[PDB]
Coordinates of C-alpha atoms and ligand atoms in Angstrom, one line a residue:
Chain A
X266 CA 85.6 102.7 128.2
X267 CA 85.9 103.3 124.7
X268 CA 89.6 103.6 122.6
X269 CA 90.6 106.0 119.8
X270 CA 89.7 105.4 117.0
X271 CA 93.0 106.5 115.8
X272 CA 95.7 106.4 118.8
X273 CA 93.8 103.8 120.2
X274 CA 94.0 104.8 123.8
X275 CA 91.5 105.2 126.4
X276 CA 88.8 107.6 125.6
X277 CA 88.1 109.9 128.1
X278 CA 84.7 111.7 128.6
X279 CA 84.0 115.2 129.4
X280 CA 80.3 116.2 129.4
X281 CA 79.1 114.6 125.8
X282 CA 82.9 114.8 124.1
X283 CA 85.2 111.7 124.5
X284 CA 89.2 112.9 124.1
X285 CA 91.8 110.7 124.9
X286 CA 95.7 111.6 126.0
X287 CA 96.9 112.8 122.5
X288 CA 94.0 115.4 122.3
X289 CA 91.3 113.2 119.9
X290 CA 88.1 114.3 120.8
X291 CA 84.6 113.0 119.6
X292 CA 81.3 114.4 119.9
X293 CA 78.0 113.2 120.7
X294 CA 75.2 113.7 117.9
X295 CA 71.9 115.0 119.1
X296 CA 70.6 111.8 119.8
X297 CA 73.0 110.3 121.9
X298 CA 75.4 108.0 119.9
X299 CA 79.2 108.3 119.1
X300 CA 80.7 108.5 115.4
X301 CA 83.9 106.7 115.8
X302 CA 84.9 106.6 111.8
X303 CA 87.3 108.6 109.9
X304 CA 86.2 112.1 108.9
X305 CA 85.7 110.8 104.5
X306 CA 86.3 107.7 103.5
X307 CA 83.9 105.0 101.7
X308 CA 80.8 106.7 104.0
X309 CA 80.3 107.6 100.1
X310 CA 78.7 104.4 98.9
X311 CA 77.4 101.4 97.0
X312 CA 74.4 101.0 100.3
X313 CA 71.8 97.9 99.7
X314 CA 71.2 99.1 103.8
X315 CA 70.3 102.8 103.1
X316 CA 67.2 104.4 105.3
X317 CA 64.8 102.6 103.1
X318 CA 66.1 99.3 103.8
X319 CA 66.9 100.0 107.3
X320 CA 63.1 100.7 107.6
X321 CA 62.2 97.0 106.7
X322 CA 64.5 95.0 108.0
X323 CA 63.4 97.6 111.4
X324 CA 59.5 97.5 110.0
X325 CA 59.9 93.1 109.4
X326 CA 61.7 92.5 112.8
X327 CA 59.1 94.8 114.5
X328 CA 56.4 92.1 113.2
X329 CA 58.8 90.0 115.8
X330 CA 59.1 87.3 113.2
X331 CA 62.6 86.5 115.0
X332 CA 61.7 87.4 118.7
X333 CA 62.4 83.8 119.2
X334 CA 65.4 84.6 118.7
X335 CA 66.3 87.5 120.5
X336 CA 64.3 85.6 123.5
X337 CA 67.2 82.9 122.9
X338 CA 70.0 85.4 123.6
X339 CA 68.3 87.0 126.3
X340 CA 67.5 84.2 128.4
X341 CA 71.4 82.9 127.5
X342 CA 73.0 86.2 129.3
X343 CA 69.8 86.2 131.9
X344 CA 71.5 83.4 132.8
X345 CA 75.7 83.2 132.0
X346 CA 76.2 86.7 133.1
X347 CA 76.4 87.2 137.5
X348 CA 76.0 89.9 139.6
X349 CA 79.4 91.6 138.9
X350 CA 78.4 91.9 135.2
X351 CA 79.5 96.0 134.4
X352 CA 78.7 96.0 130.5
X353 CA 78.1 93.8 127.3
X354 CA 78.2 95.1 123.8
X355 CA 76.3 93.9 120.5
X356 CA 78.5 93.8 117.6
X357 CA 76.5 94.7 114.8
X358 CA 73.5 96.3 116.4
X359 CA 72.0 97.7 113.3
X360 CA 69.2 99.7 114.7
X361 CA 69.1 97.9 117.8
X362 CA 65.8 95.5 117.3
X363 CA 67.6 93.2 119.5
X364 CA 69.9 95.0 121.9
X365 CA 67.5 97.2 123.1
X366 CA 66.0 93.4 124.9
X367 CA 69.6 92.7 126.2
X368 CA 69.8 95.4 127.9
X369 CA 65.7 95.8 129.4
X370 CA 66.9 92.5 130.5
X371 CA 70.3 93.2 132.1
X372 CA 69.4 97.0 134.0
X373 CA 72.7 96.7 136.3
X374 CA 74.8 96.9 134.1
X375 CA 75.8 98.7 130.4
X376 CA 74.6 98.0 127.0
X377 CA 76.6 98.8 124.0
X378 CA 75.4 98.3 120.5
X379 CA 78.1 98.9 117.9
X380 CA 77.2 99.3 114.1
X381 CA 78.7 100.8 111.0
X382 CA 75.6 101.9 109.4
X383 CA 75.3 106.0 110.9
X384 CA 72.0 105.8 109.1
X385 CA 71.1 102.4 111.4
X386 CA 72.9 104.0 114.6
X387 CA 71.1 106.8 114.5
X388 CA 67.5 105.4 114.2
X389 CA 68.5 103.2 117.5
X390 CA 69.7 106.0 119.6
X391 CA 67.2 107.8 118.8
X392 CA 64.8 105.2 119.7
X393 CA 66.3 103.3 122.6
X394 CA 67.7 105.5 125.2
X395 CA 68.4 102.4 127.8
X396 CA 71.6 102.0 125.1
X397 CA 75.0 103.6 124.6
X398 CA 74.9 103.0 120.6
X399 CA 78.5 104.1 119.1
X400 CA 79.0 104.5 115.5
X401 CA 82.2 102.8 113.6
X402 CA 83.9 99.7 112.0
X403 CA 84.3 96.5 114.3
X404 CA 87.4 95.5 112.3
X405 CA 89.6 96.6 115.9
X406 CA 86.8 97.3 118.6
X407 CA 86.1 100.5 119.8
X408 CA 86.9 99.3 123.4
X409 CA 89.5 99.0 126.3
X410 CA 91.4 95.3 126.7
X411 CA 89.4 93.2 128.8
X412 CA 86.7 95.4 129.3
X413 CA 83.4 93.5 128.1
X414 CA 81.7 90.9 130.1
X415 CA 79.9 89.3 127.1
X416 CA 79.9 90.2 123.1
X417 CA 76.3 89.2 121.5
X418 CA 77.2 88.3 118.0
X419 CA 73.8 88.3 115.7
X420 CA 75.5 87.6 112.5
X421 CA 77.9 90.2 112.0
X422 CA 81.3 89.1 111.6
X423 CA 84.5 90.0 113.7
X424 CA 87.7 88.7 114.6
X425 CA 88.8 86.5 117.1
X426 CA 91.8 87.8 118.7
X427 CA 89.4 91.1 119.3
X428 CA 87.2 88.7 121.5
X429 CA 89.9 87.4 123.0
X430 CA 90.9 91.3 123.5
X431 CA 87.6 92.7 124.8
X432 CA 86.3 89.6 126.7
X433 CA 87.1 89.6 130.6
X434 CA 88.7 86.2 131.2
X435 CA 85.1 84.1 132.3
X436 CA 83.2 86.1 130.5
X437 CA 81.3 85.4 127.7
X438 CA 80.7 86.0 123.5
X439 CA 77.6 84.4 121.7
X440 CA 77.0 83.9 118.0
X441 CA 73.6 83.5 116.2
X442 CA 74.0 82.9 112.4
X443 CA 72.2 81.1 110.0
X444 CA 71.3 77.2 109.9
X445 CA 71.5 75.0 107.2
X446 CA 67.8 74.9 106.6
X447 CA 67.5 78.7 107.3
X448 CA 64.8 79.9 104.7
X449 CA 64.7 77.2 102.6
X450 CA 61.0 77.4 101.4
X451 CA 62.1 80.7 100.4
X452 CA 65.2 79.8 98.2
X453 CA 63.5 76.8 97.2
X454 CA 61.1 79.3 95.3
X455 CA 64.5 80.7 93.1
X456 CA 66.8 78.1 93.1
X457 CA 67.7 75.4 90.4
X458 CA 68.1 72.3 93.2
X459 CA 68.5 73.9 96.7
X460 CA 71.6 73.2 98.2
X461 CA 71.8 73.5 102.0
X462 CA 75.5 73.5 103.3
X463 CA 76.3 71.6 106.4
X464 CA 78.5 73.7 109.0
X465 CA 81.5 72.8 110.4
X466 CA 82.1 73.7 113.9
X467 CA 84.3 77.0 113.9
X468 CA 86.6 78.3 117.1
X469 CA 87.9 81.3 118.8
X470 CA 91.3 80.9 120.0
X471 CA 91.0 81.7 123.5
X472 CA 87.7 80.8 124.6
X473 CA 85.8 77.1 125.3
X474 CA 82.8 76.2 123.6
X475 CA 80.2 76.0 126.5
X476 CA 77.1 75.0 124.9
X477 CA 75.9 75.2 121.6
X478 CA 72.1 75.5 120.4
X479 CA 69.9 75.0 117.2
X480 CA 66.7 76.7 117.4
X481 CA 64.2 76.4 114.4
X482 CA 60.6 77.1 113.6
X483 CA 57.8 77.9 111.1
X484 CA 56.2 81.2 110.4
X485 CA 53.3 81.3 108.9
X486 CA 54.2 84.3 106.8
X487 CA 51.2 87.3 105.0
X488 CA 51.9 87.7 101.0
X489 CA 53.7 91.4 101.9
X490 CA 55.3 90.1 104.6
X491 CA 57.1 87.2 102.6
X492 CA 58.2 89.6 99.7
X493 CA 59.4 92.2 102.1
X494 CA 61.3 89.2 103.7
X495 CA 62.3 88.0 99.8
X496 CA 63.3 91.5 99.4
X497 CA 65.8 92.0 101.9
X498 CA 68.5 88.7 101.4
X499 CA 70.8 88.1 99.1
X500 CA 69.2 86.2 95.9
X501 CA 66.3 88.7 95.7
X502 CA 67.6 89.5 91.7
X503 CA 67.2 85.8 90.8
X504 CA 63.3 85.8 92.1
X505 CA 62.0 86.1 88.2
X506 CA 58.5 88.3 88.0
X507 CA 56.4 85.6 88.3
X508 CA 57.9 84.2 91.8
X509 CA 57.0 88.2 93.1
X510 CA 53.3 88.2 91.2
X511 CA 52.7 84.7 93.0
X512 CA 54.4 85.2 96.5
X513 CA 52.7 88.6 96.9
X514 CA 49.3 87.6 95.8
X515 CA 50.4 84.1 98.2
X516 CA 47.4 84.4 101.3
X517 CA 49.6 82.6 103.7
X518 CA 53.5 81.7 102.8
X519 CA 55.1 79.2 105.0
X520 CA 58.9 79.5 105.6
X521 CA 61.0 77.7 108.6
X522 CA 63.7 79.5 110.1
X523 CA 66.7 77.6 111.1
X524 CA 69.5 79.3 113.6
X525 CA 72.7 78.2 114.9
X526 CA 73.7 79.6 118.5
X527 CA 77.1 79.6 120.4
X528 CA 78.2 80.3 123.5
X529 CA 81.9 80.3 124.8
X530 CA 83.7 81.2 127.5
X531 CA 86.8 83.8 127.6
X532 CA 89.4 81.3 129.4
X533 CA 90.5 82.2 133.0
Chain B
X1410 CA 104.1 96.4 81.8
X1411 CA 103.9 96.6 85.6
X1412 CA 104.5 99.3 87.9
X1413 CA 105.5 98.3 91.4
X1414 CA 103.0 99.2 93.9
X1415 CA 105.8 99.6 95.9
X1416 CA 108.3 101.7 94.9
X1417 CA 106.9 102.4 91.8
X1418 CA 109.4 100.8 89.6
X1419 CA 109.4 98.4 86.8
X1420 CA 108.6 94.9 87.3
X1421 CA 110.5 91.2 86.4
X1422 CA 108.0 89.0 85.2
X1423 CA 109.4 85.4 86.1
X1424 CA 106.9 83.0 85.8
X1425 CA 104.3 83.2 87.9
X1426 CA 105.1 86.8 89.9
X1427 CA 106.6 90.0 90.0
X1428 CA 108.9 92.2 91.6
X1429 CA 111.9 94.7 91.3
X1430 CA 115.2 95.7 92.9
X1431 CA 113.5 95.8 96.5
X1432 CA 112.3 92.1 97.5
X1433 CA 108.5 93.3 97.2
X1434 CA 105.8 90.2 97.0
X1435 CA 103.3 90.1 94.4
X1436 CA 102.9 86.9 93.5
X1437 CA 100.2 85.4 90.6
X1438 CA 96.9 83.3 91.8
X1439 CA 96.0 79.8 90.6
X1440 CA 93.4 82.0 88.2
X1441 CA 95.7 84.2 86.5
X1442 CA 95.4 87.1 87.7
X1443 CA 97.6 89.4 89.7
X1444 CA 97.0 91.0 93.2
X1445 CA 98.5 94.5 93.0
X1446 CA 96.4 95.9 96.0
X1447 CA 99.0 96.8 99.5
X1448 CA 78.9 95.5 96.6
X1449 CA 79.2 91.5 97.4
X1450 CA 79.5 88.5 95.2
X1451 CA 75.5 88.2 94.5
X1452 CA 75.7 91.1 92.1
X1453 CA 79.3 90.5 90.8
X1454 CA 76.5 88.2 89.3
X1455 CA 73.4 89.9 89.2
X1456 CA 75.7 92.5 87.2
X1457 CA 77.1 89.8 85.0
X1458 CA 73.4 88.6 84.4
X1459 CA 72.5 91.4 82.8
X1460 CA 75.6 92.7 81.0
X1461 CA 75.5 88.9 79.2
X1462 CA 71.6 89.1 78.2
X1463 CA 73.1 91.5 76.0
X1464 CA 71.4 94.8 76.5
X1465 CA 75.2 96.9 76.7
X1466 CA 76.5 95.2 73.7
X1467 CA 75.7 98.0 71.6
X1468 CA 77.8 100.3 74.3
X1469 CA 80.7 97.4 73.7
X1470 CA 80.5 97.4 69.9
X1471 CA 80.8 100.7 69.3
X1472 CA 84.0 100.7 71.8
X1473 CA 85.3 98.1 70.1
X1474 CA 84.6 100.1 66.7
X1475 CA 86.9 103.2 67.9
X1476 CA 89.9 100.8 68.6
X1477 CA 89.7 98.7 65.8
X1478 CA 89.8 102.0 63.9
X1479 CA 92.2 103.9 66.0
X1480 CA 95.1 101.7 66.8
X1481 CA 97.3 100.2 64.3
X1482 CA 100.1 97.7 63.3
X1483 CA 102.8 99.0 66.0
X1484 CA 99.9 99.0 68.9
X1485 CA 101.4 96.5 71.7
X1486 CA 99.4 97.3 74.9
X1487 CA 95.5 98.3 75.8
X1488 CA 94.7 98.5 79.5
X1489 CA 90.9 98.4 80.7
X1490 CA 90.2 100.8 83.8
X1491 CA 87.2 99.5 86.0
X1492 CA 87.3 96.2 84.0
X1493 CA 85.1 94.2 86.5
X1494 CA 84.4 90.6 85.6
X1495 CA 85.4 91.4 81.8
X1496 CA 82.2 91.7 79.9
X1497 CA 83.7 94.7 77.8
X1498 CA 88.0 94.2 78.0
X1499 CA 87.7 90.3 76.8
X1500 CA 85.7 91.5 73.4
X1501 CA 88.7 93.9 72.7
X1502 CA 91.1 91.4 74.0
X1503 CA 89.7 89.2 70.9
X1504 CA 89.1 92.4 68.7
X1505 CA 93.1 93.5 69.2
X1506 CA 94.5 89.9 68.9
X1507 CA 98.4 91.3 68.7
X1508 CA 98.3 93.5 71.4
X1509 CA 98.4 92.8 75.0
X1510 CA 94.9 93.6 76.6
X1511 CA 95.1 94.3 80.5
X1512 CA 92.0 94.3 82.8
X1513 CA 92.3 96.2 86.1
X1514 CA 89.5 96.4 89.1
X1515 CA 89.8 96.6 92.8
X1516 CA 87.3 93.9 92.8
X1517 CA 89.4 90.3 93.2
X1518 CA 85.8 88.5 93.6
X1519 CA 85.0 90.4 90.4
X1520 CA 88.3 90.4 88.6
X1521 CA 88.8 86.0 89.9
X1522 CA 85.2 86.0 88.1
X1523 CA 86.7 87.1 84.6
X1524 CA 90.2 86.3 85.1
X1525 CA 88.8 82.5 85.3
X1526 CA 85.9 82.9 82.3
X1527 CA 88.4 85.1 80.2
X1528 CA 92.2 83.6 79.2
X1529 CA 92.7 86.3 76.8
X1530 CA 93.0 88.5 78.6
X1531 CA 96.1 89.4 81.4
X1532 CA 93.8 90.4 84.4
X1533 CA 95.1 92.2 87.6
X1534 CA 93.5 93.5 91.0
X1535 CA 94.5 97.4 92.1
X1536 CA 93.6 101.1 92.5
X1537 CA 92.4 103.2 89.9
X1538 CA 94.3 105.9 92.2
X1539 CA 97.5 104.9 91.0
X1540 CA 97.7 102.7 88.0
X1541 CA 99.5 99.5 88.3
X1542 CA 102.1 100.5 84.9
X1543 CA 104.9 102.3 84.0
X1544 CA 105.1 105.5 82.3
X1545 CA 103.8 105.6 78.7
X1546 CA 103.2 102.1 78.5
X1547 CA 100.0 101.6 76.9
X1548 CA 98.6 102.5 73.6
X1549 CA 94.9 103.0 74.3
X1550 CA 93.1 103.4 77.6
X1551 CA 89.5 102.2 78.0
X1552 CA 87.8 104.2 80.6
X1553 CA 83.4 102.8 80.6
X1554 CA 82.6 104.5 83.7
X1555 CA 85.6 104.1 85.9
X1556 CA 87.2 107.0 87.9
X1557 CA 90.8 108.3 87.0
X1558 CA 92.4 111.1 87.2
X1559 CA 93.7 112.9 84.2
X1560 CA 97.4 112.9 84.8
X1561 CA 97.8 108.9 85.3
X1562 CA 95.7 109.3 82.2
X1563 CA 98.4 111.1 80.3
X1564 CA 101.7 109.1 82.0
X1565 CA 100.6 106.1 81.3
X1566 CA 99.3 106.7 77.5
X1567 CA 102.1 106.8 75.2
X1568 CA 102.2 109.8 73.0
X1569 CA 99.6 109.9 70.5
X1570 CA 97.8 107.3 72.5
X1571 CA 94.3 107.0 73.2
X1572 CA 91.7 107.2 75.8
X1573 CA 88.3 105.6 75.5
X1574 CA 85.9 106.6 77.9
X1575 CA 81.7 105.7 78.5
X1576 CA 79.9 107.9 80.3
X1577 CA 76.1 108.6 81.5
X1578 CA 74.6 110.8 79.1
X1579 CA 71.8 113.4 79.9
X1580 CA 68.6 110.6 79.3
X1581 CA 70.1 107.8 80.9
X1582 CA 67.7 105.5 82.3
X1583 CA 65.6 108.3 83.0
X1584 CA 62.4 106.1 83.5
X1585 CA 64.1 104.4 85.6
X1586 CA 65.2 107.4 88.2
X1587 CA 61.8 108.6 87.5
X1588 CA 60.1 105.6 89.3
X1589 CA 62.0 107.4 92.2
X1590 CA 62.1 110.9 91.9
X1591 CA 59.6 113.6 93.2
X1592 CA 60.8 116.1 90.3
X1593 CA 62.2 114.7 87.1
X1594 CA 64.9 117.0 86.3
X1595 CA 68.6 116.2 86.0
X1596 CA 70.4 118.7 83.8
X1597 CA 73.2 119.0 81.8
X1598 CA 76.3 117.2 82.8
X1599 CA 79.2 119.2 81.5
X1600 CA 82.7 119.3 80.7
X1601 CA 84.5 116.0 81.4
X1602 CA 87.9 117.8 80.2
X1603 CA 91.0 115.8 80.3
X1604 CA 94.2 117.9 80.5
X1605 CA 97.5 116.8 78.7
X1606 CA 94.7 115.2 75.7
X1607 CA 93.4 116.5 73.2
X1608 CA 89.5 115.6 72.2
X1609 CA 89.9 113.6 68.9
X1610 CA 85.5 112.2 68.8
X1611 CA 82.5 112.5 70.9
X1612 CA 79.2 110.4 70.3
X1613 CA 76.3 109.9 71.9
X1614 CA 74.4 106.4 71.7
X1615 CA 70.6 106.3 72.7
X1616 CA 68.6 103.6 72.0
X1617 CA 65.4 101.9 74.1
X1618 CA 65.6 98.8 76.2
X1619 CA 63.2 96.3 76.9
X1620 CA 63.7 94.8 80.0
X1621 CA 61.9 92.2 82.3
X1622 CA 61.3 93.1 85.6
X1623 CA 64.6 91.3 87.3
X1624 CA 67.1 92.9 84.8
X1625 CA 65.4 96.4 85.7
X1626 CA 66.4 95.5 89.3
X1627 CA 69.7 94.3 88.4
X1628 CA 70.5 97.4 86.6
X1629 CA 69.1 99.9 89.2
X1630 CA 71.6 97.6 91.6
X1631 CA 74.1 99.5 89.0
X1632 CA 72.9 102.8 89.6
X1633 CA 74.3 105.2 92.1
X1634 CA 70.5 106.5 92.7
X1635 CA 70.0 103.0 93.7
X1636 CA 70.0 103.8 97.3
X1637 CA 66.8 106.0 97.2
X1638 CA 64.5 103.3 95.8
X1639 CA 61.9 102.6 98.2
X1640 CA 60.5 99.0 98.8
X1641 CA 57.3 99.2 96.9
X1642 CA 59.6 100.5 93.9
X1643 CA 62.1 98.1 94.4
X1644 CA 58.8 94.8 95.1
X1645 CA 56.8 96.2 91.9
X1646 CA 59.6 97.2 89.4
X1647 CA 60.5 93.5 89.9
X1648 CA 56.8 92.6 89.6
X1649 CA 56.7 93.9 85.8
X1650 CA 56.8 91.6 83.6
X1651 CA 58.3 93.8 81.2
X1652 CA 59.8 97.2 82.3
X1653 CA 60.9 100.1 79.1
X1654 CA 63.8 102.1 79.7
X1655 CA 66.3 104.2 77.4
X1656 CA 70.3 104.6 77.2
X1657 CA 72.2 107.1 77.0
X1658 CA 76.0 107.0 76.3
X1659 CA 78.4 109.4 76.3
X1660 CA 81.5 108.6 74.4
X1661 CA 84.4 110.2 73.9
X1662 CA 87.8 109.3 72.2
X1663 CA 90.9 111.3 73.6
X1664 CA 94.1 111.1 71.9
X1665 CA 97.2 112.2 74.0
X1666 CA 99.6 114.9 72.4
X1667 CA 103.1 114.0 71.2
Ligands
LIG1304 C1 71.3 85.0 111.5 S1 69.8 85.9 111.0 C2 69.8 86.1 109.1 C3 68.5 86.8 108.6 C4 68.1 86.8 107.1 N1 67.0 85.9 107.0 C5 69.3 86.3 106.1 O1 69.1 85.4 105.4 O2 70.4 86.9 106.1 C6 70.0 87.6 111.8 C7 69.9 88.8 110.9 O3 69.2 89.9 111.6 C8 69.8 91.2 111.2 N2 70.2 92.0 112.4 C9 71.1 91.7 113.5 N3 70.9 92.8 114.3 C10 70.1 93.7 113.8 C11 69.6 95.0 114.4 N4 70.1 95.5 115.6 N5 68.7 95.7 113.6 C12 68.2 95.2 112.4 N6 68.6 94.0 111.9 C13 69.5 93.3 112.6 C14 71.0 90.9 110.3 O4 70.8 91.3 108.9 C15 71.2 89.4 110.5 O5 71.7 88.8 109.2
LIG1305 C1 78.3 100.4 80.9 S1 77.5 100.3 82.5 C2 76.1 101.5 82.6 C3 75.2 101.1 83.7 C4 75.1 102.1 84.9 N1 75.4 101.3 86.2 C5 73.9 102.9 85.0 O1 73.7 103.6 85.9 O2 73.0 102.8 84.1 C6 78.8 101.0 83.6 C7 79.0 100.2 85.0 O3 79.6 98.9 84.6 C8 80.9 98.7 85.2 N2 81.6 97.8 84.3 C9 82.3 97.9 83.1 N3 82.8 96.7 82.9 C10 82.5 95.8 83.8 C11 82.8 94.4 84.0 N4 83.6 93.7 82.9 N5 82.4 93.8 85.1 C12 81.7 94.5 86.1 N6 81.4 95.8 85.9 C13 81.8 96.4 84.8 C14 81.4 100.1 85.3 O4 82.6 100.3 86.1 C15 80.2 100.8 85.8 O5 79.9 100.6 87.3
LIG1306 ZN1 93.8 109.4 119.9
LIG1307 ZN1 109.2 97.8 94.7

């Protein structure tokens, strides 16, 4: 039920092309997902979250250091979503370490896990058949109005009035970001005085905040493990050599994790 | 100086904007700079580190050298292509104290950064694509590593003008890309060739580096081979205590014909 990515009008499928009315047609690649992007623009880049990257935050998640997490979600849409539930979608399904439980977990119905990173698309698709993984910026969905019975959010940012868009009046959209005390141990390894900042409660015009979770816990993290973990956020530079000598040689590192779930409701 | 990115006309500076005979918005930010526009913040920074420990300030010196030597007492205007957070346009800005020294980027959390730390400085946020002035407005062009093509390059210059530019050089950083690299070879870059100027000075500027193992990461976060770097080389280059690596600049000063 996808739109064009340039008229923006239903995209029709014939065998593994999508085309809509004005004669816009997309492949499939090889392994199953759909580039949705322009044909040269800015792919040319400045990455951080190239294949070798990729490969950690994929190799660290695989170590299910956040399945608690992805439990969290799962259980939430076990739950919200009924029997007439067609599809969800996963905004920022990087190489579906998560989505890939959404939908094991929800087999009636259609799982779609958009990302902007081909490199990350394709490594999902390839893996996990059970979802349709399309390729492009979330910036103006890749979908039909009101065609999406819930949008998992796992950090990656979006709009609101593209929820409000998307979402099926009842249905559903949940968030997971970051908590205040997300990491600290780690920061508190780099940083002058740690400063934790308290979140104010956000809202998406159109829907009604229908429960709202905290969910925190310690991992008992391996020297690698911690490093790899170091590696991949965004102070890693400040971590001087001796932090990296110390936290890799470190038998057992301890770090809590802090996160901040949502849940709302696309009004009737 | 401005050039609307509208209709491409001049612009009425009046107070704290500017527009032209169309009703166009661009207005002037609380830091001093000016949005002409129709990586992340972390390395804005982690860039910034490293250019202020000082290991470019040869590359900024010798800049500085070729305009202090090139321009003279008529010089008015000096625009900065690429100008990031200012490390390099601020030190002419001081250096040419009677001409006007402009800083462009298309990086407001960047340019905000500079346009805040430098005063001296007239910052603005645009395209290199088209440049944000009006024809044959400036009197030098500094170019360190920024893209533009050749013909803004010559409309913009006033006759007899200058362009600066800094460019890798054959060694640069080679230890660096040959922490990641299978084969070590990366030839001969050739001809940067800028039509409508005439090449007036070229110099190359190689000297070692001495770096600690955070500023080598910082750096390769500079580098477009960046993206190739596996973990371990990205984990035990910041390990080092101490990480050698050389420069290599190529510099050349282009002067536009009358
Ligand atoms: C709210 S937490 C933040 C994690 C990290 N500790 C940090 O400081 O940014 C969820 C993180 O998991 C990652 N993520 C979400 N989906 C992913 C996917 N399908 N594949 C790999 N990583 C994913 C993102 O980088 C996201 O920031
Ligand atoms: C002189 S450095 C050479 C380092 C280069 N990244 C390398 O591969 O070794 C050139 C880089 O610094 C940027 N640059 C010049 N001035 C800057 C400033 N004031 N703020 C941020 N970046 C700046 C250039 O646009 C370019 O990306
Ligand atoms: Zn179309
Ligand atoms: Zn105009």
């Amino acid at each position: 039920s996808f739109s064009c990515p340039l008229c923006h009008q239903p995209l029709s499928r014939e065998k593994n092309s999508y085309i809509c009315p004005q004669r816009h047609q997309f492949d499939m690649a090889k392994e199953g997902y759909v580039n949705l992007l322009p044909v040269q623009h800015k792919r040319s880049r400045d990455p951080g979250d190239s294949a070798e990257m990729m490969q950690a935050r994929r190799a660290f998640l695989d170590a299910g250091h956040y399945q608690p997490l992805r439990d969290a979600i799962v259980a939430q849409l076990r739950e919200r979503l009924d029997d007439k539930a067609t599809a969800v979608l996963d905004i920022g399904c990087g190489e579906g370490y998560y989505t890939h439980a959404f939908a094991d977990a929800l087999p009636e119905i259609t799982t779609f896990g958009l990302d902007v990173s081909k490199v990350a698309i394709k490594a999902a698709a390839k893996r996990y058949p059970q979802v349709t993984f399309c390729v492009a910026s979330s910036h103006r969905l890749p979908f039909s109005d009101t065609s999406m019975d819930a949008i998992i959010r796992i950090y990656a940012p979006c709009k609101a009035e593209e929820l409000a868009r998307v979402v099926k009046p009842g249905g559903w959209v949940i968030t997971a970001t970051p908590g205040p005390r997300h990491l600290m141990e780690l920061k508190g390894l780099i940083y002058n005085e740690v400063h934790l900042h308290a979140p104010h409660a956000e809202q998406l015009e159109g829907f009604t905040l229908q429960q709202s979770a905290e969910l925190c816990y310690p991992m008992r993290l391996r020297g690698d493990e911690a490093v790899a973990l170091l590696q991949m956020t965004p102070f890693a530079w400040r971590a001087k050599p001796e932090v990296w000598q110390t936290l890799a040689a470190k038998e057992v590192f301890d770090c809590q994790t802090d996160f901040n779930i949502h849940l709302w409701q696309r009004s009737y």
